[PDB]
């Protein structure tokens, strides 16, 4: 499927830039308080909007998610997101070949409320792709 290399493709881009974080791929994550700030990449949705009489042309949501320690102020997340991700995800040659269109959706914040071990910044992308 396209997802494995898709996840691989973005991982190459971010790892190619300066590090400063672990890159736990996919979704199992499991951190413990040793491997802090790190990022993850996965997909959601993956439906069958036809949109095209000759090709299936599926689409799905792409999540670039970065976790930061507990109650660090959003400024670090804001700086992290708009410097270490958004400029990087501006254009990647591998992605253009793999998928049809690349559209941004939005990004929010959330954190562990009870206890409060972690903070999370989530960036959501929209990918239209053909099987």
């Amino acid at each position: 499927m396209k997802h494995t290399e898709l996840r691989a493709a973005v991982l190459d881009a971010l790892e190619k830039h300066d590090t400063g974080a672990t890159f736990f791929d996919g979704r199992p994550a499991v951190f413990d308080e040793a491997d802090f700030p790190a990022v993850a990449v996965y997909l959601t949705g993956a439906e069958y909007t036809g949109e095209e009489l000759d090709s299936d042309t599926w689409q799905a949501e792409l999540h670039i998610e970065v976790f930061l320690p507990a109650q660090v102020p959003d400024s670090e997340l804001d700086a992290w997101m708009e410097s270490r991700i958004y400029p990087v995800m501006s254009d990647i040659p591998a992605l253009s070949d793999l998928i049809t269109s690349m559209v941004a959706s939005g990004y929010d914040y959330r954190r562990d409320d009870d206890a409060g071990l972690w903070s999370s910044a989530d960036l959501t992308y929209v990918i239209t792709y053909e099987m």
């Binding site: 951190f31 413990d32 308080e33 320690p69 670090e76 206890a115 071990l117 972690w118």
Partner: protein
């Protein structure tokens, strides 16, 4: 000193328990700066899942020291339990002879006040 004939009793008990378990530690930075404090340290468990699964198992240090030493502490200041460092996050109100100290781990996160 205490107009209850009971506070001296419970406070003296607080001296015994801290002396009979829970080691001693020292403070780094803050108003107290270099100073040695004896309390009772423990670390329970706490797991959060966030998304589909992001299990982030950690700890929750606590000290339970008498209030008089721990005065004028605030929150940004740090400390170390011997070889391992921490930082104060919340100070419980006085129980009557002591209070609990809730610690983070590593560097305190920023200030973000003004």
């Amino acid at each position: 000193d205490f107009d209850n004939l009971f506070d001296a009793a419970i406070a003296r008990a607080d001296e015994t328990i801290r002396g009979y378990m829970g080691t001693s530690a020292t403070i780094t930075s803050g108003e107290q700066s270099g100073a040695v404090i004896r309390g009772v340290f423990d670390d329970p468990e706490n797991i959060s899942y966030a998304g589909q699964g992001v299990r982030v198992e950690g700890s929750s240090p606590s000290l339970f020291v008498r209030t008089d030493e721990v005065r004028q502490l605030r929150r940004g200041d740090t400390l170390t339990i011997g070889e391992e460092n921490f930082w104060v996050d919340r100070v419980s109100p006085d129980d009557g002879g002591s209070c609990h100290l809730w610690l983070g781990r590593g560097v305190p996160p920023a200030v973000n006040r003004r």
